[PDB]
């Protein structure tokens, strides 16, 4: 809404801030791992913004997925550590590749899925930092006195995921695998199977509070606080 | 919400604000180019320029209807600052699904889907 | 009636801390910038930033960046100019003022005074 | 960046005449340019804005003009309240005040 100018930027404007993440419910059943795109800094050759490549990786158990800023390596593509919070920011999130996993010829890798992704912009703000690529003169009319340094152009938006409800809950119901789509009708090769899970509508942070030192009176010293975080899963299969 | 009085801009009061646009899904199949309509400087009380409804072949890298409405923003706002900069100085183009589809042969609109 | 009143003759030994104070009455704090402005005796009148306590926007003559924090409280209604390590040049008189952007008059309204002396 | 040279340092002239000031800044200012009156023991008090927009309730014998680099600031008929101390003051781009005028009475 309102960011007047002059602006006077420091040295170490970073900010204590939060938010939450865009809202993703998505489960895959094959009998093969799955496989994820991510953008990661790739070889190539000017301005000095890296190099963008997509790579293809299995899906490991662990791996976060996209959270609103992308499916990116975040180590390598934003050295400053500071971009994205920090579950995300020394990690690389990952999007399932619908296509190719669709898209290989005997179907092993998508027997049947399901996802339910949504993200709404909940605030504005923009980076701290030299712009590495400035606007040019075509599109602006210079600006002198207060105007005459021009502000960052660097927007990034933070995302939300709006709301949950049980009415759109994926989970807790019966998969009848009757056809699959693709060529391989739920055969299970190796006597192995793969169920990829994500589900961000339970993603409540418990927290908690323990006390160091008894006193009549509260003081902020007295305590120290901790941030934990479950997950309760029960597979259930019929097999033929 | 509050916008009292008194209350006059200076000389430069350009502010560095961002947003997000209006949202659009849409696909046209056809044999044929589609036709995209906007509105551009047409050639006297007032200066304001004169609007023309303009019709034209939507390109692969036009920029869609954000809001502002379908306009020439580079013609008709000439201060380069009343939009966005990845529009300031573009063409906005809506699809002009009534020429498309009053066409008598047809060959635009085989089929299309919309949601904004 | 605007008003802005302001406190007065704090002497501090060199070299600590002071925190000068400036709540007006009449008008909201958050609603026009807070502009500080020094004048060492026999000299002429300095610049020293200015606050928009609607946010805290913090704007400083680059002389004064290095020791002077200047902040604001809204729920008080009031206005602070901090000086860290004090010296002998440090001692001045010291105003508040009241800058409008929406308006721009420069120094709308200004405090009586706050004079500052550094000794032991 | 934008300094301000205003000349004389000091004035004087007997009560009814006329006075000026005059204030060079480093470079254009586009007429963004204010006039003080300091008293010892008050605070300053906003005389003028905007090179010749006079506030409420000064009177009419105050006085602005000029443009780009060069202006200018008259008192016509003087009076014995005027004895004090104006500066001159941009604010195109942060602020800067001049370097102040003693104005004393001649009897």
């Known amino acids: 809404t309102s960011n007047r100018y002059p602006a006077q930027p420091g040295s170490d404007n970073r900010e204590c801030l939060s938010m939450d993440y865009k809202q993703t419910q998505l489960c895959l059943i094959g009998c093969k791992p799955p496989t994820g795109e991510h953008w990661g800094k790739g070889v190539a050759s000017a301005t000095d913004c890296p190099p963008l490549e997509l790579f293809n990786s299995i899906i490991e158990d662990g791996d976060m997925v996209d959270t609103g800023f992308g499916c990116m390596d975040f180590g390598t593509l934003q050295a400053n550590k500071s971009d994205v919070p920090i579950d995300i920011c020394n990690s690389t999130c990952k999007y399932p590749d619908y296509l190719k996993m669709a898209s290989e010829p005997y179907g092993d890798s998508l027997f049947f899925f399901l996802r339910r992704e949504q993200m709404f912009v909940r605030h504005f703000f923009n980076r701290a930092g030299k712009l590495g690529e400035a606007v040019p003169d075509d599109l602006y009319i210079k600006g002198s006195g207060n105007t005459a340094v021009i502000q960052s152009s660097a927007f990034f938006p933070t995302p939300s995921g709006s709301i949950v409800t049980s009415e759109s809950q994926l989970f807790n119901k019966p998969y009848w695998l009757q056809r699959a789509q693709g060529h391989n009708n739920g055969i299970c090769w190796g006597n192995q199977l793969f169920v990829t899970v994500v589900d961000t509508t339970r993603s409540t942070n418990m927290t908690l509070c323990t006390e160091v030192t008894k006193e009549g009176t509260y003081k902020n010293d007295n305590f120290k606080e901790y941030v934990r975080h479950v997950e309760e899963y029960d597979l259930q299969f019929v097999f033929q | 919400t509050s916008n009292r009085y008194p209350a006059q801009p200076g000389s430069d009061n350009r502010e560095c604000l961002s947003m997000d646009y209006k949202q659009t899904q849409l696909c046209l199949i056809g044999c044929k180019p589609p036709t995209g309509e906007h509105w551009g400087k047409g050639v006297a009380a007032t200066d304001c320029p004169p609007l023309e409804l303009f019709n034209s072949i939507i390109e692969d890298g036009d920029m869609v209807d954000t809001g502002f409405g379908c306009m020439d923003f580079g013609t008709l706002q000439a201060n380069k600052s009343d939009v966005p900069i990845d529009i300031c100085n573009s063409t906005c183009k809506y699809p002009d699904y009534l020429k498309m589809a009053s066409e008598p042969y047809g060959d635009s609109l085989f089929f299309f889907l919309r949601r904004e | 009636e605007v008003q802005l009143q302001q406190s007065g003759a704090e002497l501090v030994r060199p070299g600590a801390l002071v925190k000068l104070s400036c709540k007006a009455s009449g008008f909201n704090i958050k609603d026009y910038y807070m502009h500080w402005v020094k004048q060492r005796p026999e000299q002429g009148l300095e610049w020293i930033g200015w606050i928009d306590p609607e946010n805290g926007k913090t704007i400083y003559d680059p002389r004064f960046r290095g020791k002077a924090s200047i902040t604001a409280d809204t729920s008080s209604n009031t206005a602070y100019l901090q000086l860290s390590s004090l010296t002998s040049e440090d001692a001045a008189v010291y105003y508040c003022?009241?800058?409008?952007?929406?308006?721009?008059?420069?120094?709308?309204?200004w405090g009586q005074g706050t004079t500052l002396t550094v000794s032991a | 960046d934008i300094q301000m040279t205003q000349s004389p340092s000091s004035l004087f002239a007997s009560l009814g005449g006329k006075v000026t000031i005059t204030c060079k800044a480093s470079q254009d200012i586009n007429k963004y340019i204010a006039w003080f009156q300091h008293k010892p023991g008050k605070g300053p008090r906003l005389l003028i804005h905007y090179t010749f927009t006079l506030q409420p309730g000064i009177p009419s014998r105050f006085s602005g003009s000029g443009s780009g680099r060069d202006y200018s600031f008259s008192i016509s008929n003087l009076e014995p309240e005027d004895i004090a101390t104006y500066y001159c003051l941009q604010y195109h781009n942060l602020y800067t005040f001049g370097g102040g005028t003693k104005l004393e009475i001649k009897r």
């Open positions: 003022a009241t800058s409008n952007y929406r308006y721009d008059r420069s120094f709308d309204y």
